[PDB]
């Protein structure tokens, strides 16, 4: 009823049969060609893995189990007296395919409070890390260390049936999601607040509010932004580096802690997780010359004096998108309601007219619209979260929801080891002659 | 002449231009098809990536830059008073594609001795790790924490030219390889020798001997085993989960420390790097159930009786190999020479006689011959290394050579972010019906 685990248990047989029917109809059907260029080009355009939780709709954005972001904002439970989707509900949806009821989210909230405790060895390890060790490295190291708590790893050693893998994966995943805020908040407080303590979990708060409590914030609107932020960054298909890493490492039957920590190492990469900070450095830098008020000359110069120089207007491209990311619109509506008078937001609102001066003149992007990362930093900074090195941790905590919801399903559905074939250049040259 | 970095700087242009030409002419050549089954089946049989350092023919086994393991055992430098190939030479081959001279191996040994220091925070972290934190978890976490030393991470933030990525990757890779034995031997000692100290690096020893010193072994034969073991586990194409994880995380420009720690999380998965242990647990069990002094039939009975209950013979089969793994033969040859009368070896040897037979009469197997992991456990147990949870640490330290050699080349050649497209079951079903 409220126990997500039993609801999952009832869903899994239906999904297994649906896949079995489809593979029996179409297993041998060709869905794509592989070219030499796709192998050299990081598998671009190659349909390579199944990933159930989210799908990129080319005209409406990311859908979560079919629901668009605006749909999730309408339908998902909010905290009482609040406007923003609770990330608990998002997880419920990713796991079940169903929009939760208020009571389901409430149950899930209390489940994560109960499982939140950190083992002292992780606490010690985090307390001992130096300030020159990047927050994302701290996050990945601590999650790896948490695998001492893995129920899945122990049960596998004792020869548990394949038919039960999903159960222990579920337990580990809920445990991990529950702990993430505590870990994330210890990192923040140790780096940016002189090692002061995270305080206690409250058995009756939502995940996001426990999170902002432990970070040391007390600002309803900040907690509301966190709720929205954790919801919208949660999943973005399977092919992104963090999701795919988790998928790949998970397919070797590494437990959720190891799979997630590997993912965070992937997220830590500059071409994945650093877009947020780039933008905010640029915007801050833009109020060097501009001051508070300007024009498109101001803008198109760099726009052309940068895009035609070599670099970019940060936060106006993607790897497969094609329209104003709903993830941006999300934050914009947020900012228009709650901080209309903020200079930087105002600048960001100004940039949303100009840089879309159809930058297709150069023809180099195939995307003249702002992505998620264009809006995120200003909002964080407004609420007093200024330590940009930390922003990708927030992204990580969010992404946990997506990749763990899929990990449960990968094991439920008996997905095998990911093991493609590689070739050398020499090898490929000989293969093509024949 | 001897500076590997200068030799590599000279090779890179040649190969860039070679790939540029190949992709202009043959970039659109189709080298395979994707089916629905492949997407569900972990990309099995899918030509997915270019990986230059090694290629695994199903037929004759792994080749390292065109050389087989027997060709390498012969051609690669040995230590003075030594029979086994030094991993240093293996690494030089993978990086350069050339067999190194004695002098180049000597120079690389001194380079790795000089770069072997750990920062105090990494020492502290290892020494505080509890004894219930698995060695692979310690290894991954410690390597993540070393990324505070990353030259590449700091260069990238200050805006280095793409043309120079490979140089910082190379440096960071040389630093990590040098440090790994120190990390690995600290783990070994903290867990299995009540925290006794690892001692010093000798600037005139090879890498494998420094390592066995730090571990607390001073048996010349065990050093020779280590040299052989580190050489042969070094690389196995790009499609295995450890190399692939490293390739994937690297392609987001995560530094070598993060890419390697991610790979170890992959390696720690039961379907990737625990077959060694699994083999040894089965052999030890078998040795009780049929006595040490064993017949040829009672052994064939047990293997027959294993196959019926529906249970695997560990150490036989592979995801692509379809004949005897030359990394097995290597270990066999070493055993015949050094421990022919070892009860456990005899049994392993007997099983090579017996087991391939029976899997032929099955028709289920495809690969009825042993992999590397069938032979490794008993060689380690023989020399006094009986802590099975540690075995995969050795594999990891070996695999560093291969994945880092390739990581240098992936950056040198400008390999982009790995980003295949994922589909849901629902989405796939609709795509095929189109
Ligand atoms: C390595 C391995 C996982 C690859 O198998 P695979 O790619 O999934 O598939 P195969 O084509 O080998 O499978 C053919 C059939 O023979 C079986 N088979 C494979 N190796 C077998 C073995 N050593 N003993 C018994 N049966 C075996 C498979 O399970 C399969 O049976 P099924 O169709 O009834 O399910 C498999 O050979 C195995 O189980 N090996 C034992 C563990 C090991 O040694 N691992 C180290 C290498 S990674
Ligand atoms: O090749 C594989 O998939 C697993 C393996 O043997 C290795 O990585 O060496």
Tokens, residue B306: 């294993």
Query: What resolution in Å is listed for this PDB structure?
Result: 1.8
State the structure-solving technique.
X-ray
Query: What is the total residue count of chain B?
Result: 434
Distance in Å, CA B339 to ligand 2 centroid: 26
Among A14, A19, A22, A43, pick the best mutation site for testing chain B contact (most B Cβ within 10 A).
Answer: A43
Q: What are phi and psi of B14, to 5 degrees?
A: -55, -45
Tokens, residue A26: 């179409």
Strands A61-64 and A67-68: antiparallel
Q: How far apart (Å, rounded) are the C-alpha atoms in residues B137 and B265?
A: 7
CA atoms within 13 A on the CB side of B32: 22
Residue A178 CB partners (closer than 8 Å, separation 6+):
A111, A112, A113, A114, A115, A116
Q: How many Cβ atoms from other residues are within 10 Å of residue B301's Cβ?
A: 12
Tokens, residue B179: 């440090």
Nearest to A150 by CA among A186, A129, A132, A176: A176
> Is A281 in CB contact (< 8 Å) with chain B?
no
Catalytic pick among A233, A272, A338, A375: A272
Asked if residues A50 and A195 have their Cβ atoms less than 8 Å apart, the reply is no
Chain B partners within 8 Å of A67 (Cβ):
none
Q: How far apart (Å, rounded) are the C-alpha atoms in residues A331 and A69?
A: 12
Q: How far apart (Å, rounded) are the C-alpha atoms in residues A139 and A120?
A: 16
Angstroms from A108 CA to nearest CA on chain B: 25
Q: How far apart (Å, rounded) are the C-alpha atoms in residues A417 and A254?
A: 11
Domain B275-382 class, CATH top level: mainly alpha
B46 → chain A, closest CA residue = A420
Residue B248 CB partners (closer than 8 Å, separation 6+):
A241, A244, A245, A248, A266, B262, B418
> Is B97 in CB contact (< 8 Å) with chain A?
no
Show contacts of B275-278: CB within 8 Å, 24+ apart.
B275/B314, B275/B315, B275/B371, B275/B373, B276/B373, B276/B376, B276/B377, B276/B388, B276/B391, B276/B392, B276/B395, B277/B377, B277/B388, B277/B389, B277/B391, B277/B392, B278/B314, B278/B315, B278/B373
Among A18, A30, A36, A405, pick the best mutation site for testing chain B contact (most B Cβ within 10 A).
Answer: A36
- Whether A373 sits among the annotated catalytic residues: the reply is yes
The SS3 assignment for A34 reads strand
Chain B partners within 8 Å of A252 (Cβ):
241, 266-267, 269-273
Residue A316 CB partners (closer than 8 Å, separation 6+):
A355, A359, A365, A367, A368, A369, A370, A371, A374
Counting ligand 1 atoms within 8 A of each CB, the residue from B317, B359, B367, B368 with the most, and so the one to mutate, is B317
Strands B421-423 and A47-50: parallel
Tokens, residue A125: 């390890």
Q: Is the C-beta atom of B358 inside 6 A of ligand 1?
A: no
Q: Is the C-beta atom of B236 inside 6 A of ligand 2?
A: yes
The SS3 assignment for A61 reads strand
Tokens, residue A147: 């695998």
DSSP class of A99: P
B148 → chain A, closest CA residue = A133
Strands A47-50 and B47-50: unpaired
* Ligand 1 atom nearest residue B240's Cα: 48
Using CB atoms, which residue from A30, A129, A239 is nearest to B33?
A30
Q: How far apart (Å, rounded) are the C-alpha atoms in residues A266 and B249?
A: 5
Please give, one letter per residue, the 3-state secondary structure of chain B. CCCHHHHHHHHHHHHHHHHHHHHHHHCCCEEEEEEHHHHHCCCCCCEEEECCCEEEECCCEEEECCEEHHHHHHHCCCCCCCCCCCHHHHHHHHHHCCCCCHHHHHHHHHHHHHCCCCCHHHHHHHHHCCCCCCHHHHHHHHHHHHHHHCHHHHHHHCCCCHHHHHHHHHHHHHHHHHHHHHHHHHHHHHHHCCCCCCCCCCCCCCHHHHHHHHHCCCCHHHHHHHHHHHHHCCCCCCCCHHHHHHHHHHCCCCCHHHHHHHHHHHHCCHHHHCHHHHHHHHHHHHHHHCCCCCCCHHHHHHHHHHHHHCCCCCCECCCCCCCCCHHHHHHHHHHHHHCCCCHHHHHHHHHHHHHHHHHHCCCCCCCCCECCHHHHHHHHHHCCCCCHHHHHHHHHHHHHHHHHHHHHHHHHCCCCCCCCEEECHHHHHHHHCC
Q: How far apart (Å, rounded) are the C-alpha atoms in residues B60 and A144?
A: 37
> Is A410 in CB contact (< 8 Å) with chain B?
no
Q: In what order do the strands lie in the sheet with A61-64?
A: A54-57, A61-64, A67-68
* Ligand 2 atom nearest residue B236's Cα: 9
Residue A172 CB partners (closer than 8 Å, separation 6+):
A149, A150, A151, A152, A255, A256, A257
Chain A partners within 8 Å of B320 (Cβ):
419, 421
Catalytic pick among B209, B236, B247, B318: B318
Q: What is the DSSP string of A214-254?
A: HHT---HHHHHHHHHHHHHTS---S-SHHHHHHHHHHHTT-
Asked if residues A40 and B418 have their Cβ atoms less than 8 Å apart, the reply is no
Q: How far apart (Å, rounded) are the C-alpha atoms in residues A351 and B78?
A: 64
Q: Is the C-beta atom of B375 inside 6 A of ligand 2?
A: no
Return the exposure string of A70-95: e unless at least 16 CB atoms fall within 10 Å of the residue's CB, then b: eebbeebbbbeebebbbbbbbbbbbb
Nearest to B39 by CA among A27, A316, A282: A27
Q: How far apart (Å, rounded) are the C-alpha atoms in residues B300 and B302?
A: 6
Tokens, residue B378: 């008993």
Residue B269 CB partners (closer than 8 Å, separation 6+):
A249, A250, A251, A252, A253, A254, A258, B241
| The CATH classification of domain A1-31+50-417, taken from the options 3.40.190.80, 1.20.1250.20, 1.10.580.10, 3.40.50.720 | 1.10.580.10
Catalytic pick among B172, B272, B325, B375: B272
Q: Is the C-beta atom of B325 inside 6 A of ligand 1?
A: no
Ligand closest in space to the Cα of B355: 1
Asked if residues A384 and A338 have their Cβ atoms less than 8 Å apart, the reply is no
In angstroms, what CA-CA distances link A188 with A181, A194, A392, B148, B256? 10, 9, 12, 17, 25
Q: How many Cβ atoms from other residues are within 10 Å of residue A204's Cβ?
A: 11
Q: How far apart (Å, rounded) are the C-alpha atoms in residues A311 and A42?
A: 22
Residue A399 marked as a ligand binder: yes
Provide the greatest CA pair distance for chain B.
Answer: 68
Q: How far apart (Å, rounded) are the C-alpha atoms in residues B101 and B89?
A: 8
Asked if residues A242 and A213 have their Cβ atoms less than 8 Å apart, the reply is no
Distance in Å, CA B339 to ligand 1 centroid: 29
Q: How far apart (Å, rounded) are the C-alpha atoms in residues A345 and A332?
A: 9
Residues 153-182 of A with CB under 8 A from B: 153, 156
Put simply, the answer to whether B28 touches A37 (Cβ < 8 Å) is: yes
Nearest to A139 by CA among A292, A261, A2, A282: A261
Query: What is the total residue count of chain A?
Result: 434
Distance in Å, CA B45 to ligand 2 centroid: 15
Ligand closest in space to the Cα of B326: 2
> Is A310 in CB contact (< 8 Å) with chain B?
no
Show contacts of A298-306: CB within 8 Å, 24+ apart.
A299/A351, A299/A354, A299/A355, A299/A357, A300/A354, A300/A357, A303/A354, A303/A355, A303/A357, A303/A359
Binding-site residue numbers of B are: 327, 399, 419
Provide the residue ranges of all domains of chain A, joining segments of one domain with +.
1-31+50-417
Give the closest residue (by CA) to ligand 2 atom 8: B240
Place of tokens 């997506």: A402
């Amino acid at each position: 009823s409220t126990n997500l685990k039993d609801i999952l248990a009832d869903l899994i047989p239906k999904e297994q049969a649906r896949i079995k029917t489809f593979r029996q109809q179409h297993g041998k059907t060709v869905v794509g060609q592989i070219t030499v260029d796709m192998m050299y080009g990081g598998m671009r355009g190659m349909k390579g893995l199944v990933y159930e939780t989210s799908v990129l709709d080319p005209d409406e954005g990311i859908r979560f189990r079919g629901f668009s972001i605006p749909e999730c904002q309408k339908l998902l439970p909010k905290a009482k007296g609040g406007e923003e989707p609770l990330p608990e509900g998002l997880f419920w949806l990713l796991v079940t395919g169903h929009i939760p009821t208020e009571e389901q989210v409430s149950w899930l909230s209390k489940e994560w409070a109960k499982r939140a405790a950190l083992p002292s060895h992780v606490v010690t390890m985090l307390d001992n890390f130096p300030t020159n060790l990047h927050p994302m490295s701290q996050l990945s190291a601590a999650v790896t260390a948490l695998n001492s708590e893995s129920n899945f790893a122990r049960a596998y050693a004792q020869g548990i049936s394949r038919t039960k893998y999903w159960e222990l994966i579920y337990e580990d995943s809920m445990d991990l999601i529950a702990k993430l805020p505590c870990v994330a908040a210890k990192i923040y407080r140790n780096l940016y607040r002189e090692g002061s303590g995270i305080g206690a979990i409250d058995s009756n708060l939502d995940w996001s509010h426990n999170f902002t409590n432990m970070l040391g914030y007390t600002d309803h609107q900040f907690t509301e932004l966190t709720r929205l932020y954790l919801t919208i960054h949660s999943d973005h298909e399977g092919g992104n580096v963090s999701a795919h890493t988790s998928h790949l490492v998970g397919s070797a039957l590494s437990d959720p802690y190891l799979s997630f920590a590997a993912a965070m190492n992937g997220l830590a990469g500059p071409l994945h997780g650093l877009a947020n900070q780039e933008v905010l450095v640029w915007l801050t830098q833009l109020q060097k010359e501009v001051g508070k008020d300007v024009s498109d000359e101001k803008l198109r110069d760099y726009i052309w004096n940068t895009l035609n120089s070599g670099r970019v207007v940060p936060g106006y491209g993607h790897a497969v998108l094609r329209k104003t990311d709903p993830r941006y619109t999300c934050q914009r509506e947020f900012a228009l309601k709650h901080l209309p008078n903020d200079p930087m937001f105002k600048l960001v609102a100004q940039l949303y007219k100009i840089v879309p001066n159809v930058l297709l003149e150069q023809g180099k992007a195939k995307n003249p619209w702002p992505n998620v990362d264009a809006h995120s930093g200003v909002l964080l900074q407004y609420y007093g979260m200024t330590e940009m090195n930390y922003y990708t941790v927030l992204f990580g905590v969010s992404r946990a929801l997506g990749v763990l919801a899929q990990l449960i399903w990968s094991r439920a559905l008996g997905f095998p080891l990911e093991r493609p074939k590689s070739m050398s250049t020499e090898g490929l040259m000989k293969f093509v002659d024949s």
